[PDB]
């Protein structure tokens, strides 16, 4: 498989900035979702899940083809709860019918990180909708009940190394686990719709206790009301992951820098960019625009 990025015909930076503006204006507006967490956290999770299906061995899956729109990928058990992020973006797609689905689902994640005070994420247009038979089979997305060795092996399929994996996992400072979606319950911290290095500080500073929850899954719980998935708790049981955790806990700007690079890499895996293609766009926030 080769997936060559093709620009939506006749569109430039200013068009994509209009789609970004519509998603961010709708984020401000619908602030009541999930006990006033807002749709920020569920939109960066949709962008990682349509990206996380990629397989470096045969160039299948990844963000290119927009195939989350098809029933098979939409109804995957590991995607439960993401129907909310899809529903949110749907009026935005009716307003800009020219943008491809892969470009929309992925720009949704970029807009959410930057509106939640996160780092600027460079983004590239050019994903193209592919047919229903290119939709990846279920089961390429990761389990939560596992250890640091599973996490290392998994992210190798997306050729993410240790630094990339630890930066990327910092996203779990956002939102929460929901019992009806995943069999896990609880937030990762206090500031869960502001993008910070909080996930790392919690993992180093809380007295975590292992307990079973109401779905009979184990998770790590702290006195403070926060939780950790076994796979996130893994990052302090592995000596290479633990030194990077410590680095991000002590330096939020190094976390922002590395998260920016790894998240763009994640959203562009599997896509060939012709060098006449536009350079990656940096979108302005609402605030920077006075909107
Ligand atoms: C081994 C890797 C990962 C596993 C096993 C995993 C698993 C999960 C699970 C079980 C949930 C809760 C789902 C729910 O009940 O609603 C969750 C939530 C979330 N995940 Fe991950 N995750 C992984 C990697 C990532 C990465 C790479 C990102 C983003 C860069 C990410 C971002 C999020 C966010 C923001 C949420 C919050 C969802 C919400 O608030 O609704 N995850 N993750």
From Swiss-Prot:
It is found in: Mitochondrion matrix; Mitochondrion intermembrane space. One of its GO terms (cellular component) is mitochondrion. One of its GO terms (biological process) is response to reactive oxygen species. Heme b binds at residue 172. One of its GO terms (molecular function) is peroxidase activity. It is an enzyme of class 1 (oxidoreductase). Transmembrane segments: none annotated. The keyword Acyltransferase does not apply. Its cofactor is heme b. It catalyses: 2 Fe(II)-[cytochrome c] + H2O2 + 2 H(+) = 2 Fe(III)-[cytochrome c] + 2 H2O. The active site is at 49 (proton acceptor), 188 (tryptophan radical intermediate). Signal peptide: none annotated. The modification Phosphotyrosine is found at residue 150. Its main location: mitochondrion. Keywords: Heme, Hydrogen peroxide, Iron, Metal-binding, Mitochondrion, Organic radical, Oxidoreductase, Peroxidase, Phosphoprotein, Transit peptide. The record marks 45 as: Transition state stabilizer. Binds 1 heme b (iron(II)-protoporphyrin IX) group per subunit. Forms a one-to-one complex with cytochrome c. Destroys radicals which are normally produced within the cells and which are toxic to biological systems. Present with 6730 molecules/cell in log phase SD medium. Belongs to the peroxidase family. Cytochrome c peroxidase subfamily. This is Cytochrome c peroxidase, mitochondrial.
